[PDB]
């Protein structure tokens, strides 16, 4: 039974584990970026280095950004607005080219075209009555 419950929950756990590992790659990378160069058996030298630096700064931003320019800010500011415009309007294209929208749009128009053609037929009956009356008069 433990074999069975291990087998039948394997796929969901495997997908969640892969995705959680891919998420925690960032935590691993930033942690190892913030650690000192020297190993734990030799970290006392880097520790006294940070101690000496801290007392030197006292006696006298955790991340990895890129630091670009204003013209660059303008180019990435433009770059985002292509990505906005392409997204919403392709979403509009996907919605307009879908089957359920096409069937609904066809159906409401066969609505309007049947009532309107019916107006064309019922009004038309007046015109041949007028044409027969005109041919009768002349």
């Amino acid at each position: 039974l433990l074999i069975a419950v291990f087998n039948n929950t394997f796929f969901e756990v495997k997908s969640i584990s892969n995705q959680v590992w891919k998420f925690q790659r960032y935590q691993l990378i930033m942690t190892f970026h913030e650690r000192p160069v020297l190993p734990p058996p030799l970290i006392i030298f880097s520790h006294m280095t940070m101690i000496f630096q801290h007392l030197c700064c006292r006696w006298r931003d955790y991340g990895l950004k890129l630091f670009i320019t204003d013209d660059e800010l303008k180019k990435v500011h433009d770059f985002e607005e292509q990505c906005i415009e392409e997204y919403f309007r392709e979403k509009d294209d996907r919605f307009n080219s879908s089957n359920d929208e096409r069937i609904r749009v066809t159906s409401e128009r066969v609505e309007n075209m049947s009532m309107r053609l019916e107006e064309v037929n019922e009004r038309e009956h007046s015109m041949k009555a007028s044409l027969q009356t005109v041919d009768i008069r002349l």
Partner: protein, 632 residues
């Protein structure tokens, strides 16, 4: 007992003039059936026909109050009946539908939309429908509309019909004093008298004494419509209630009814329909073929004359007088608009706008109150509308506090810019609004004031400053975040003031505000407009997740926590779909989007904000994985 002692009635006691038929008198009743003063010699007495009518048969069972009154009664007494005895509030709108007394059939698409709107305006504005009472023609179509209303909708449309008392079938069936009388929707085809409509709400059956003849209700209905329009509306800005004149088809008489409404002080705008035929179609052909109002040329005048002479079967001179009355109506062309197929609503909502006759700020505030963006777009924001300075900004503030996203779209699209509108004081007034949907912002402010100054419950008359909003963003963001509100620059300007007070990036402050008070649709609108969308979406994701956790922690409503988690997932999905689009366009510029320092978001990084928001799908994406590999 007040109805009998205030309202009067008149009964036919005359010399019985035979005219044509010896049994038929001047009042039309039978010669032995007896028991204005000219030839009827009628006498006044208290009424004995009022109360409630139980409509037996005809689908749904509906009870309609009724009263028989004299045709010469003062309208103030009748209006006092309606407000006090029938417990009817003063309507925001009066609806006056006229048409032909003969029965007719219209197109099915025309009829269905005609019904579906006449219901919907009388729902949304809480209007009063004024019909002809008896179940003939246009009133029959109103009753079919109200039948569809009862079959699919939950309102009680107050749909008062005014009919002559003498023409209704089974007059002895409605005799009583505050007694429920059953009524038959049965209507005999042999009898010339017609039954009342089954799906009406109240009746003002008016007796001039005569039986089987019309004309006993037109003057009383008109004078009552004038008296109600003289009453001030509850807004108390200096306007009465507005009145529409609804026309479906009609005959010769509705032409003069239109003329009386247009040539009135105050003017009553007059609205027809097309497709039904007869008089409504000839107002239609007159209106499209009109040029400059009364300036009608020779070819279209004789076309109008021959169509009047053919459809109405009138003589050469009679068509000429009806064309004269038509031209007198056409002089006031701006009041008449035609409904030509391909509703009742636009009809009514337009008559509200020019019956108010106020400035365009007043029309815009009215349409904002009705939540009608399409009506405001087609009429108020037409070409040729003059606008006061600063009124559009006030309407922007009113649309923002009353959760009208579609009015915000229209106002931005009509010249209003967010940079020139958003100030510090306006954003505080937004953060202290009491309208709109509920929110958990007051609990967040109370918690951060208790944490900052361990007091307790905030006073009821507390104005939430932007510094307190800044602290709320601090508690929700977590970590080492630092909001622009709580920095020393913003506190200095707040102390020194309560384009320096204008926000350089107003859509960011709007996004944070719409996220905080749980207004999802406006948050999605404000995400599209403005810049730093990926930063804004990740911030909104963390804010919605943190408020969901906070609502679950304080034992609040679980539905609030579920909806906040749904909003967090929607903003996170927006961030992934933006990342996909950036990766498809340019891989490098996507990475520079992912890494550049966000000065408006505490010098953070989009990659940091996604990890803080615990958005797993953003990091597991291939672009972020290869960026992390490059960092490795």
């Amino acid at each position: 007992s007040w109805i009998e002692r205030a309202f009067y009635k008149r009964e036919c006691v005359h010399i019985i003039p035979s005219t044509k038929d010896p049994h038929r008198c001047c009042c039309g009743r039978l010669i032995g059936q007896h028991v204005w003063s000219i030839s009827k010699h009628t006498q006044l007495s208290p009424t004995d026909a009022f109360g409630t009518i139980e409509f037996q048969g005809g689908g749904h069972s509906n009870k309609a109050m009724y009263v028989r009154v004299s045709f010469d009664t003062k309208p103030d007494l009748l209006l006092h009946l309606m407000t006090k005895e029938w417990q009817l509030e003063l309507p925001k709108l009066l609806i006056s539908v006229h048409g032909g007394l003969q029965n007719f059939e219209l197109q099915p698409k025309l009829k269905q939309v005609f019904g579906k709107g006449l219901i919907k305006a009388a729902m949304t504005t809480g209007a009063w429908i004024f019909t002809g009472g008896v179940n003939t023609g246009v009133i029959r179509h109103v009753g079919d509309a109200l039948k569809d209303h009862a079959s699919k909708s939950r309102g009680k449309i107050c749909t008062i019909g005014i009919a002559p008392w003498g023409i209704v079938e089974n007059q002895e069936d409605l005799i009583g004093r505050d007694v429920v009388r059953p009524y038959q929707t049965m209507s005999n085809p042999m009898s010339k008298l017609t039954v009342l409509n089954s799906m009406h709400s109240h009746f003002i059956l008016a007796d001039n004494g005569t039986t089987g003849k019309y004309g006993a209700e037109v003057k009383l209905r008109r004078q009552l419509e004038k008296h109600i329009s003289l009453q001030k509306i509850n807004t108390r800005i200096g306007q009465g209630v507005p009145v529409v004149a609804l026309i479906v088809e009609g005959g010769p008489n509705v032409i003069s009814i239109v003329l009386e409404y247009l040539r009135d002080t105050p003017p009553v705008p007059v609205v027809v329909c097309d497709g039904s035929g007869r008089a409504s179609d000839i107002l239609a052909f007159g209106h499209k073929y009109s040029e400059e109002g009364g300036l009608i040329n020779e070819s279209l005048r004789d076309q109008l004359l021959v169509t009047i002479q053919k459809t109405f079967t009138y003589t050469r001179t009679q068509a000429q007088h009806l064309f004269i009355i038509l031209m007198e109506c056409m002089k006031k062309k701006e009041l008449i608009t035609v409904f030509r197929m391909g509703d009742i609503d636009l009809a009514i909502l337009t008559a509200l706008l020019k019956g108010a006759n106020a400035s365009a700020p007043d029309q815009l505030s009215l349409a904002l109150a009705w939540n009608r963006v399409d009506i405001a777009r087609s009429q108020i924001f037409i070409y040729g509308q003059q606008w006061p300075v600063g009124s559009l900004e006030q309407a922007m503030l009113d649309a923002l506090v009353l959760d009208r996203v579609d009015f915000v779209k229209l106002l931005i699209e009509n010249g209003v810019s967010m940079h020139r509108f958003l100030t510090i004081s306006r954003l505080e007034e937004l953060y202290n609004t009491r309208h709109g949907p509920s929110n958990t912002l007051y609990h967040l402010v109370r918690d951060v004031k208790k944490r900052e100054y361990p007091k307790g419950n905030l006073p009821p008359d507390y104005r939430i400053s932007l510094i307190d909003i800044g602290l709320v963003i601090e508690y929700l963001m977590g970590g080492a975040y630092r909001c622009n509100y709580t920095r020393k620059r913003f506190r200095t300007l707040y102390h020194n003031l309560f384009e320096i007070n204008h926000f350089p990036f107003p859509f960011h402050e709007l996004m944070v505000w719409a996220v905080l008070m749980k207004r999802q649709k406006m948050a999605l609108f404000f995400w599209q407009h403005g810049e730093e969308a990926m930063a804004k979406a990740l911030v909104a994701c963390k804010l919605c997740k943190a408020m969901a956790h906070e609502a679950s922690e304080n034992d609040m409503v679980d539905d609030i926590s579920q909806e906040l988690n749904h909003n967090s997932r929607d903003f996170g999905q927006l961030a992934v779909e933006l990342l996909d689009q950036s990766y498809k366009q340019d891989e490098q510029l996507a990475m520079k989007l992912l890494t550049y320092e966000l000065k408006n978001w505490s010098n953070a990084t989009c990659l940091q904000l996604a990890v803080a928001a615990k958005h797993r799908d953003f990091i597991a994406h291939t672009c972020s994985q290869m960026l992390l590999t490059d960092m490795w």
